[PDB]
Design a binder for this molecule. Structure first.
Ligand SMILES: NS(=O)(=O)c1ncc[nH]1
Ligand SMILES: [Zn+2]
Length: 257
């Protein structure tokens, strides 16, 4: 099954998931001179005051920090969205070196990593239903560049040594995802997909223009994770990103001028 290596990576996914070559795939390159400022877009509403993190899991592709999504405790609303989307998990995509790692690009620039806060539309009742719908998910994408440390990232990076290999999880309560946000909520938005199999076309992408800064030491610790299971030959978890996909018949809108 699928992964990020030469033999099972993005160029192979279409064989088991033919939607890989569909009309609304992600990620995409954001051409900042083609995206149109849309003065009808609202400010995002990111309501994470009551967020309840539970657990962190190495799933063999990335690590997910999971939230209690059994009530409306951490929600994304506003922006291009209608209705209420509950945070279920966040995760990252990152590179073997700082010059690559992000899935979205900005005028072809790749950032060192990209954070995805994944939310599902409550009008569909559960995540498995939501991913069957064109407006089922909203993913908030945040670029990471390497410079100064991100203080609110450090609790994530210090637990990584305890979930080194596929299938390992650890308690991860009381984490505040508001410490992963940049200062500005200006964003681009377009209709797309999950960037991992099954690649379903159910996502409203909201990608923030302002990257967060993380330290070289912080991203080095991401790169010490493993794709493999315990006791298996070591395969460092690096380069777990899908490259940019054709934009096709889609328009990327900017919330800012
Ligand atoms: N990478 S992504 O945010 O499209 C995603 N979320 C859950 C599975 N894949
Ligand atoms: Zn992702």
């Amino acid at each position: 099954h699928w992964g990020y290596g030469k033999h099972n990576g993005p160029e192979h996914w279409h064989k088991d998931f033919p939607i890989a070559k569909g009309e609304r795939q992600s990620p995409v390159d954001i051409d900042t001179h083609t995206a149109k400022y849309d003065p009808s877009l609202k400010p995002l509403s990111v309501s994470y005051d009551q967020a309840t993190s539970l657990r962190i899991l190495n799933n063999g592709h990335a690590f997910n920090v999971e939230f209690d999504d059994s009530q409306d405790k951490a929600v994304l609303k506003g922006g291009p969205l209608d209705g209420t989307y509950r945070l279920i998990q966040f995760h990252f995509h990152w590179g073997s070196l700082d010059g690559q790692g992000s899935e979205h690009t900005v005028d072809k620039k790749k950032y060192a990593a990209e954070l995805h806060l994944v939310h599902w539309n409550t009008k569909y009742g559960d995540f498995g239903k939501a991913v069957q719908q064109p407006d089922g998910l909203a993913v908030l994408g945040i670029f990471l560049k390497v410079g100064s440390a991100k203080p609110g990232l450090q609790k994530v990076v210090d637990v990584l040594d305890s979930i080194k290999t596929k299938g390992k999880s650890a308690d991860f309560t009381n984490f505040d995802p508001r410490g992963l946000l940049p200062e500005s909520l200006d964003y681009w938005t377009y209709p797309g997909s999950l960037t991992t199999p099954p690649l379903l076309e159910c996502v409203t992408w909201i990608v923030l223009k302002e990257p967060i800064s993380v330290s070289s030491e912080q991203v080095l610790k991401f790169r010490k994770l493993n794709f493999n299971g315990e006791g298996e030959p070591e395969e460092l978890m690096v380069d777990n990103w899908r490259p940019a996909q054709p934009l096709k018949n889609r328009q990327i809108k900017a919330s800012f001028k």
